[PDB]
Design an enzyme around this catalytic site. Sequence first.
Site, PDB file in Angstrom:
ATOM      1  N   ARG A  37     -39.797 -48.736  21.063  1.00  0.00           N
ATOM      2  CA  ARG A  37     -40.313 -47.385  20.936  1.00  0.00           C
ATOM      3  C   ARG A  37     -39.698 -46.386  21.910  1.00  0.00           C
ATOM      4  O   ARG A  37     -39.641 -45.190  21.615  1.00  0.00           O
ATOM      5  CB  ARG A  37     -41.835 -47.363  21.090  1.00  0.00           C
ATOM      6  CG  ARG A  37     -42.552 -47.687  19.808  1.00  0.00           C
ATOM      7  CD  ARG A  37     -44.058 -47.872  20.001  1.00  0.00           C
ATOM      8  NE  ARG A  37     -44.778 -47.863  18.724  1.00  0.00           N
ATOM      9  CZ  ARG A  37     -46.100 -47.991  18.557  1.00  0.00           C
ATOM     10  NH1 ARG A  37     -46.907 -48.164  19.588  1.00  0.00           N
ATOM     11  NH2 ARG A  37     -46.626 -47.930  17.321  1.00  0.00           N
ATOM     12  N   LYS A 207     -57.570 -54.014  16.078  1.00  0.00           N
ATOM     13  CA  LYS A 207     -58.022 -52.651  15.721  1.00  0.00           C
ATOM     14  C   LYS A 207     -58.674 -52.638  14.326  1.00  0.00           C
ATOM     15  O   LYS A 207     -58.365 -51.795  13.450  1.00  0.00           O
ATOM     16  CB  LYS A 207     -56.843 -51.667  15.791  1.00  0.00           C
ATOM     17  CG  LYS A 207     -56.361 -51.464  17.234  1.00  0.00           C
ATOM     18  CD  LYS A 207     -55.205 -50.484  17.290  1.00  0.00           C
ATOM     19  CE  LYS A 207     -54.759 -50.185  18.715  1.00  0.00           C
ATOM     20  NZ  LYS A 207     -53.476 -49.401  18.692  1.00  0.00           N
ATOM     21  N   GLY A 365     -46.224 -51.229  16.817  1.00  0.00           N
ATOM     22  CA  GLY A 365     -45.844 -51.524  18.200  1.00  0.00           C
ATOM     23  C   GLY A 365     -45.839 -53.025  18.427  1.00  0.00           C
ATOM     24  O   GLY A 365     -44.869 -53.593  18.958  1.00  0.00           O
ATOM     25  N   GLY A 388     -50.213 -48.274  11.985  1.00  0.00           N
ATOM     26  CA  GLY A 388     -51.170 -47.382  11.325  1.00  0.00           C
ATOM     27  C   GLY A 388     -50.551 -46.135  10.705  1.00  0.00           C
ATOM     28  O   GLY A 388     -50.891 -45.767   9.604  1.00  0.00           O
TER      29      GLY A 388
END
Length: 408
Positions: A37, A207, A365, A388
Amino acid sequence: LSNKLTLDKLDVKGKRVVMRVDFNVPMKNNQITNNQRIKAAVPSIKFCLDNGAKSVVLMSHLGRPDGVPMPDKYSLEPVAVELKSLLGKDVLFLKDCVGPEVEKACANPAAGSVILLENLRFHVEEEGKGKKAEPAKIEAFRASLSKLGDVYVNDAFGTAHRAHSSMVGVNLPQKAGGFLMKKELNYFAKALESPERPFLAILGGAKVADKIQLINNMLDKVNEMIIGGGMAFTFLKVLNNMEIGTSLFDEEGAKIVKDLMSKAEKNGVKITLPVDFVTADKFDENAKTGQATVASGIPAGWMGLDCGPESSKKYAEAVTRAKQIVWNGPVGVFEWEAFARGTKALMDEVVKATSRGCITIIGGGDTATCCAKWNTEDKVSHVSTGGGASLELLEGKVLPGVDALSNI
Ligand SMILES: Nc1ncnc2c1ncn2[C@@H]1O[C@H](COP(=O)(O)OP(=O)(O)O)[C@@H](O)[C@H]1O
Ligand SMILES: [Mg+2]
């Protein structure tokens, strides 16, 4: 971004550039485990410097500190170090992201200065909640961030689904999408236009509260869905009355499980849930481990942290049928060897599928880190910095981080 300002059309000469990036990188034993990233933002950063930017002020979140400063646990300082190597330029790290002292560091920097601010989520105003929220302080936080540059760039594709202060609330006249935002959106635009079918979504990871809420709309786009990783336990508890011990469970999502299964049936979406597990006596790399099936249930005080061999076979079957795949979320705690087999096995299958012409898209990620760990980044069709964010594009939504950009 066809109707949005992008960085290639933004005059940066002599301008301070304040830039949202997604530097929410994975960490293990306190080290960065994947710099994907960070590397991914370097093209926008370099472009700004090469085209005469006075400065580049970089801002991101890291993890979920919930509006309290947590510099011991979630500081971005290690990212500053890593960015140095990747850029070829030094970078100044500030211990906050607002106001008086940060504002002075950013007001009039030496030419070519790169500055990284501290974790935006140390302030409850970034997310707007913690830890509860308060409008006048939210406004004030956004005003402060806005003073740190003359023009704004958003290259934070991985966070583009979050309508957070740094992502939608910066008030400067020119707000431009960066090159990573452009690359990712363009890839998905093309890949989602007329997907190859059967189109499989693979949803794992954690999550669960967030991810379970994406399924309803995804069920209108895909032909099959693997529901694995931490999310499976909510479905199995509800549908099978399975004992799940201390495994991840989403009380809110549990209430819509039967409706989602109904909708999958209505839409001809085949749902593959795991049928067996590798269990752990606590959430630890060195936990004692066991095995469970859906029939046996997971014992009290134990958690399922990987799927088992029978699940892997069913996942493989779904992959063999796919002509296109979007995968977000490892199907076990792949960071720990005891709980990595299910995800490695699925990775093997996804690589094999690519080799016979499957369009395979891995995003997130953590899920991208699977690619780095097993050296498969160039063995699938696309590895995205967004997890997401990518699933929200699959749902057919406009991302708030993109919507907030300047129109042309
Ligand atoms: N059964 C499980 N229980 C708890 N955590 C899990 C389980 N399976 C996977 N995970 C964890 O989910 C985490 C990442 O999920 P997520 O953040 O949703 O993915 P991404 O970052 O790719 O979007 C990984 O760190 C992995 O350890
Ligand atoms: Mg993650």
